[PDB]
Design a protein around this ligand. Structure first.
Ligand SMILES: *Cc1c(COP(=O)(O)O)cnc(C)c1O
Ligand SMILES: *Cc1c(COP(=O)(O)O)cnc(C)c1O
Ligand SMILES: *Cc1c(COP(=O)(O)O)cnc(C)c1O
Lengths: 441, 439, 424
């Protein structure tokens, strides 16, 4: 049985189970080799330039994550030490976002910013509904709505479809590639549950002007009995911007920012599987959304869509916090910023590229092809050629009012080093040369 | 700085950050030691008997999970091999649950059964809503409802709160530690989006009689233009019952079971982080819950609440499928069954216990203390002593119409060996003795 | 950046140096998805760890590693017997780095043996160089042998009816100056076997009528560790009387990572004594034939590991599996249509093909290589050897670690690439 060579065994002579469980078990070495082999031919994650999600952690953190895979992040009474870590993380992030000590912030780890955005939105919906009932607003006339920029990530569309919320979408244009705050009051009405500000737009790399939105909202709220507050989607900005622009006011320093989310597995430096949501004060969380759990043979409040899941990633987040601290994070984000700027400068130096975003805010570059009548090929062709050399660079359309603009994004993470970025620009230069003399589509 | 002994260094003279980041970085070996040390003082997971969640996997699966932590399960176009493995697990699981060849099943991995239950309940709500509109029901008069046993896991209560559904709860009693199928139609009306049958109840370890419920539903549905269908919450049973009672009809063999969820991290044998939901046919999934993702420069359908997350657990699930196959899963679940039955027999031989559930169905044992005015201690005191001897055994009240009944539960998972269970019973014997003479 | 011209002045941290080298290595192909080479891209975990643990051993150093030397001699014995070295005669052999060095050493034995014959017969050595006769699908090492040692290459061209040595005409290239004929048991470009049994009979007839006889060297770089396990009845080896020496690459179908080959002589008389350098091991002195001096013993020890671990049945199971994958691929390409198979994997597990004539097809095999590379597979395009240099082919070489599940994935990738190309 183990006498069989791994690549002489019966299982290596047949296809893998695709529709049903095979009758018999296999040796651990055989199953292992077959599963790993199915995975060989997908992009090496380090060359995936299409994602915010982290593709490197230090070996110590990898080993640590491995050793805590059995831990169950929901089970506070059985894993009270993991639950303490989570609490420390929430405190740490709250302080990073200037949660005021005069109010009692609450928050939680989530699987990612999607779960967090949905919880935040649900908190807004439920708080809005109590206001609406008390002011005799007719709940059958219209659906509640939220106001958000057209750069929204798909989780906000899921939130709206799943919970019967209209989306009041503030479109982008050539000058407003972030929320047009000057016009935001045109989308607000009695049924508005809140306004989402995006601190790092997935499509463009740009910050919404949260400080200006906060000023407008402060003034709007004196004029109505249907006040409206800000949720910040800082999926990506939340772990980046405090270390490189600490004086930019986007967070709980703004009076009307009531909740904030971020993904640990974006610029929090953790592999996929953790996000974070924080409410400035226990009142911006309606009690009917809080399910209470056993802890210290007593009680703790929880806001959660998921139940059981791995604590590995939240532990990893604490490992990062302790390991890097403020200065370590800052050094990492600064080098990331620097590679993004080298890249934006390299693409203008090559010509044929017009930069939509040059990496001044998030470390992300967006560009389109400058129109040239003597070019058969599109960015789709460029993405194909770059795959030949390992690189994944996605091509996509901009969101509404710029759906005629086709772009490519490069997102730069902590493990995209300066040397690898010089290599990328070589590979990219050769691709442009190869496509300039191509004879097929 | 790298010369310092780990326990001679400045970071071990100071407390860890609790309220804010420290300013300065630490060396990797020091950070690693400090985080692991914070974790020493929780109960070794293998001795946690309150939970269905897996606390062991074989070393080859551990290493494969480690090696795949950077993969992002949502990102199909960048990890198409991982997405193909996912599709293969949906097929495998659909087949295991007898999805009919004549219809076209769909499904997806989830983080767990919570997200699965919620996506199923939402499919039911949206499909109910179209049917209700088309029959002119007044949608303003009552919230939609769902019907379920009182032993529902908290994720159904969350589903109901979050989506404004009324829960019509069928109570338990002394003779019905699972759904009272004969009474279920008292709870159904035109507003009912569906009935949830639980294939392995968290509190009691018992199967809802899904076959009987299907026959009740089939009869009810011929008399009405508001038909009702069954969603099976098989969080636990989905990966247990197919291997030990393959003939028990609970799954898509029943005509009116339109969807089923199971937790891969329960009897599917994966560490926490993977669940599964399957629909018997595409028509039971409303198109407006499907958000589309690029793949091979085309389009692929997804139902999902979460977005980015680890692929490690789902690859682990496929590893288990390949490594164990049907017979391996069967041998594991059989051993697990054997241990549960050993624990049930040892509690009865000790005297002083009444078995509420004896582990014939899920491998779970439920018990209360028999009436006795001379005994001054409670099951809460027993939990506390068992904890001193290393074990976590929860004490809790039974659900509706038994909320005055206090019980203990022991769940038996794959990694509770017979050896270890003999040791548990010695420990339980000693703790009883200790409680009988303390104050 | 990393040093590209000069040494840096200062050392780096281990983790930093490690990270920098490994990152530089990132962006080259996962080796296992390269279908253009015979070189092994996988070994079992015990072998990898044994290799790592004997990295320090020196294969050349016999008095200092006598147990490693014994292992070499065992492998030589094992390989001799596999290729049916006769017991009536006295075979010798050695490990080498690869088939190149082995080919070179065998070619040099032939040159030196020819030159003595030639002097004895009064042949004018100044009038022509010695020559060797070989098929036009020769591997580059034969051309380096000829250039390095001043031997003319008498090349037998290939054509549509002969994708291996043309035995009908091989003697047209043979003359008094011929040091030998090389028969290739697995041609790199085409995967085909030269008809060794026929060449042997032809040579036996030739040799009966001249005092300048010619013998056969078999370049079994690939076939040597493959053909004995799936076609043991095929006579290609020392069962043929005029086969005097044979080479094979252990890092080809011998299943070892790069860095071992083997050369065996059927008898001591085919190895001129001037090529033998003797050494100090155990009580006496051991004969050596070797171009290289110090080098790793890891691959050698890897080969013995493989022989002990798998034995006959294990090698056979691996090679039969490999055979089945190759056959699966040939049948999958015929199912798709549009390909003309030059080799269909009945001989070596290599499939070789061209696109069938079609005027309404805008794309070529070069474009197909490109789309496969996008999908992660290296399947390059190249011209055939002399007389078919205008014919453009693609090749898939199947090795031990190309399992059947992986091959179904490859075929789905290939199917999709074709579709994409037909809309381009
Ligand atoms: C990616 C992203 C999300 C979703 O994040 P996950 O962590 O993948 O769930 C939400 N908002 C924004 C701005 C994002 O970039
Ligand atoms: C635990 C459980 C759930 C929740 O499962 P997770 O996988 O933890 O989300 C749902 N239903 C039942 C019956 C359960 O036992
Ligand atoms: C590759 C090859 C060689 C050279 O082999 P190495 O082991 O790389 O030195 C010689 N002959 C044939 C037939 C080959 O395929």
């Amino acid at each position: 049985e183990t006498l069989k060579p791994i690549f002489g065994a019966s299982a290596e002579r047949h296809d893998l189970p695709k529709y049903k469980l095979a009758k018999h078990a296999l040796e651990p070495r055989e199953a292992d080799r077959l599963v790993r082999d199915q995975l060989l031919d997908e992009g090496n994650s380090r060359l995936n330039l299409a994602t915010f999600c982290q593709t490197y952690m230090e070996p110590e953190a990898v080993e640590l994550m491995k050793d805590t895979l059995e831990k169950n992040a929901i089970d506070k009474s059985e894993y009270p030490r993991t639950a303490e870590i989570e609490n420390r993380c929430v405190n740490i992030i709250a302080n990073l976002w200037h949660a005021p000590e005069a109010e009692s912030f609450t928050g939680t780890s989530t699987i990612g910013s999607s779960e967090a955005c949905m919880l935040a939105g649900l908190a807004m919906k439920f708080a809005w509904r109590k206001r609406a009932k008390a002011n005799g607003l007719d709940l059958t006339a219209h659906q509640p709505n939220i106001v958000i920029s057209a750069g929204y990530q798909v989780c906000w569309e899921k939130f709206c479809v799943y919970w019967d919320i209209d989306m009041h979408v503030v479109p982008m244009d050539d000058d407003h590639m972030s929320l047009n705050v000057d016009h935001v009051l045109d989308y607000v009405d009695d049924y508005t549950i809140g306004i989402v500000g995006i601190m790092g737009i997935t499509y463009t790399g740009q910050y919404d002007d949260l400080a200006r939105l906060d000023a407008v909202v402060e003034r709007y709220n004196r004029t109505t009995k249907f006040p409206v507050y800000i949720h910040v989607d800082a999926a990506s900005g939340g772990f980046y911007t405090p270390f490189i622009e600490p004086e930019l006011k986007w967070d709980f320093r703004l009076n009307n920012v009531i909740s904030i989310n971020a993904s640990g597995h974006k610029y929090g430096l953790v592999y996929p599987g953790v996000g974070w949501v924080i409410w400035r004060d226990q009142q911006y969380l309606p009690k009917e959304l809080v399910f209470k759990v056993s802890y210290l043979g007593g009680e703790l409040p929880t806001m959660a869509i998921n139940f059981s899941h791995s604590a590995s990633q939240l532990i990893g987040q604490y490992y990062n916090f302790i390991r890097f601290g403020f200065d370590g994070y800052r050094e990492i984000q600064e080098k990331t910023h620097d590679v993004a700027r080298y890249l934006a400068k390299s693409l203008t130096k090559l010509g044929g590229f017009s930069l939509i975003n040059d990496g001044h805010e998030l470390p992300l570059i967006c560009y389109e092809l400058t129109a040239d009548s003597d070019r058969e090929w599109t960015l789709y062709d460029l993405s194909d050629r770059l795959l030949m050399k390992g690189w994944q660079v996605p091509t996509y359309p901009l969101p509404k009012n710029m759906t005629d603009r086709v772009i490519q994004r490069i997102v730069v993470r902590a493990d995209f080093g300066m040397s690898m970025a010089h290599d990328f620009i070589d590979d990219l230069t050769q691709a442009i040369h190869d496509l300039d003399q191509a004879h097929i589509v």
